[PDB]
Amino acid sequence: SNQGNNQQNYQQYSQNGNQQQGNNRYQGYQAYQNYQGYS
Amino acid sequence: SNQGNNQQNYQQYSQNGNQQQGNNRYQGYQAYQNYQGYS
Amino acid sequence: SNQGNNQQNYQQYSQNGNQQQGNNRYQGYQAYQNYQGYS
Amino acid sequence: SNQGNNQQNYQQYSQNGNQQQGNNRYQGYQAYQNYQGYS
Amino acid sequence: SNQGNNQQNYQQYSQNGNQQQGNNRYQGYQAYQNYQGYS
């Protein structure tokens, strides 16, 4: 609970990489040639 | 609950990468040649 | 619940990447040559 | 529930990528050569 | 429930990508050469 001054900077840069900006809560889980360049 | 001044910056940059800006809650889960350039 | 001043910036940039800006809640789940450039 | 000043910016840019700006709730699920450039 | 000042900006830009600006609720589901440029 922000009761003041809050600034947050979220930058994600990848390649073939899954990206999540968030939270994950688990209550009951059962489981079993590219070119990129930046100038 | 924001009771003040809240600024948040969400930037996601990828390639072949799934991107989610959010939260995930699990209550009962059962499971079993590209070119990109930025100037 | 925003009771103040809230500004949020959501930017997603990808290629062949699925993009979701939101939340996912699971209550009962059972499961089993491109060119892009930016100037 | 927004009780104040709320501004949110949602920008999604991709290629062959499915894009959703929203939430997904699952209660009972059973499952089994392009050129693009921006100046 | 917006009880104040709410402004939201939804921009989706893709190619061969399905785009949805909304929410999806699942209660009982059973399942089994283009050129584009922007100046």
Residue numbers in the entry:
A (entry chain E), B (entry chain C), C (entry chain A), D (entry chain B), E (entry chain D): 4 to 35, 47 to 53
Task: Please give the exact wording used by the authors of the publication that reports this structure.
Yeast prions have provided an experimental system for obtaining a better mechanistic understanding of the prion strain phenomenon. It has been shown that the yeast [PSI+] prion state is caused by the formation of amyloid fibrils of the translation termination factor Sup35. Sup35 contains an N-terminal highly aggregation-prone prion domain (N or PrD) and a polar amino acid-rich region (M) (M124-D253). Interestingly, Sup35 can form distinct fibril structures, or polymorphs, that underlie distinct [PSI+] prion strains. To understand the atomic basis of the prion strain phenomenon, we determined cryo-EM structures of Sup35NM Sc4, Sc37, S17R4, and S17R37 fibrils, revealing markedly different fibril core structures with distinct amino acid packing.
First, we determined the cryo-EM structure of the Sup35NM wild-type (WT) amyloid which forms at 4°C, termed Sc4, to a resolution of 3.1 Å. The Sc4 amyloid core consists of four β-strands formed by the residues S4–Y35 in the N-terminal region of the prion domain (PrD-N) and the amyloid core region was approximately consistent with the previous observations by the H/D-exchange NMR and mass spectrometry analyses. Notably, unlike the majority of fibril structures, the overall Sc4 amyloid structure lacked extensive intramolecular interactions within each layer of the fiber. Instead, Sc4 fibrils showed intramolecular interactions only in the limited region spanning Q14–Q24. Remarkably, the Sc4 amyloid, which is almost entirely composed of polar residues (right), has a stabilization energy of + 3.1 kcal/mol per layer. The poor stabilization energy can be explained by the fact that intramolecular interactions in each layer primarily involved a small number of residues such as Q15, Q22, and Q24. Together, the low stability and ready chaperone-mediated fragmentation facilitate the production of many Sc4 fibril fragments (propagons)12 that recruit more Sup35 monomers to the fibrils, increasing overall Sup35 aggregates and leading to white, strong [PSI+(Sc4)] phenotypes.
